[PDB]
Design a protein around this ligand. Sequence first.
Ligand SMILES: [Zn+2]
Lengths: 57, 63, 114, 113
Amino acid sequence: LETANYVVKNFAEHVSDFMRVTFVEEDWSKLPANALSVNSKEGYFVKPSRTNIYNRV
Amino acid sequence: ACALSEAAYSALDQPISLLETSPLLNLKNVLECGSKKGQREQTMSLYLSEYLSKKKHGFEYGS
Amino acid sequence: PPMDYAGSRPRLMDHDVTLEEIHKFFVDYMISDTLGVISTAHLVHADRDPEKARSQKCLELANLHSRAVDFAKTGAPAEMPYALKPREFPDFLERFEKPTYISESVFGKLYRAV
Amino acid sequence: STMKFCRECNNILYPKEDKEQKILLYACRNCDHQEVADNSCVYRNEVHHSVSERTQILTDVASDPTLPRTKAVRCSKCQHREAVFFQATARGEEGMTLFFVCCNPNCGHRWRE
Ligand SMILES: [Zn+2]
């Protein structure tokens, strides 16, 4: 149970179609900055190297 | 006059490559004031003192 | 009189939004987003140093907090810098990672009385 | 900037224009024969500045000038002044925004605005 929204209230037939998708840690915590775009030196200036979890999300 | 002669005889005359000429030639060009050799290259100065400092990054946007 | 509350220039794209630059902006919020970190590092910096909210280190966090909360309007990162975390926390938040020094401030007597 | 050779004459033709019948007719000097133009283009040049001829390291002129520096900002990881600034575009944007590159050695940082 939750407070309904105006975007849901007009579509009273598709209430089984709305879905909230959260993206959390395996331990259900907040995703830090170490799993996504780990820093790595390449040449003169550094650049964030994307990992596989970024391309999965 | 000998106080300026002593700063010219012991001048470090190791010249920079092409941008700066010499520490003695830069002294002679300051001492030669009225020697108007020509109007070929004249350099000005435009100080950026205005109301741009109240905004964020005003000097870099003004220059 | 406060400082300049004006923000940066908005990042107007050339073409239209084709639903791919929204996902690349949404996943870009999980990284480089220090909202509670700046306020936490500013709250533990005034009790540790004299002349509270007036030093050269306490003003950079207050300037960066105007950009750290306006990420949803303008796409500019907070870029929380180094050499500003005090590497120690007082006895209010009680984090066991950093060494908890004995606090002496307005909040220290406010905590020791309770 | 073009040149042709005359058939059975071997001379350099002249790009003249006929008055009544509007057609580019090429005529040589000695044979005075006529020939139509298959290109209609009497000039082609990849024109450049060319104001400095062998005067690069002997004159104080500069084709590509250096980027300016400013010491009013502090970088994030390096915590140092004397960073350069310029204006460019990034992946499509109406206008140009300010950029920064940390000119301090062993730092390697560059932040937008
Ligand atoms: Zn001929």
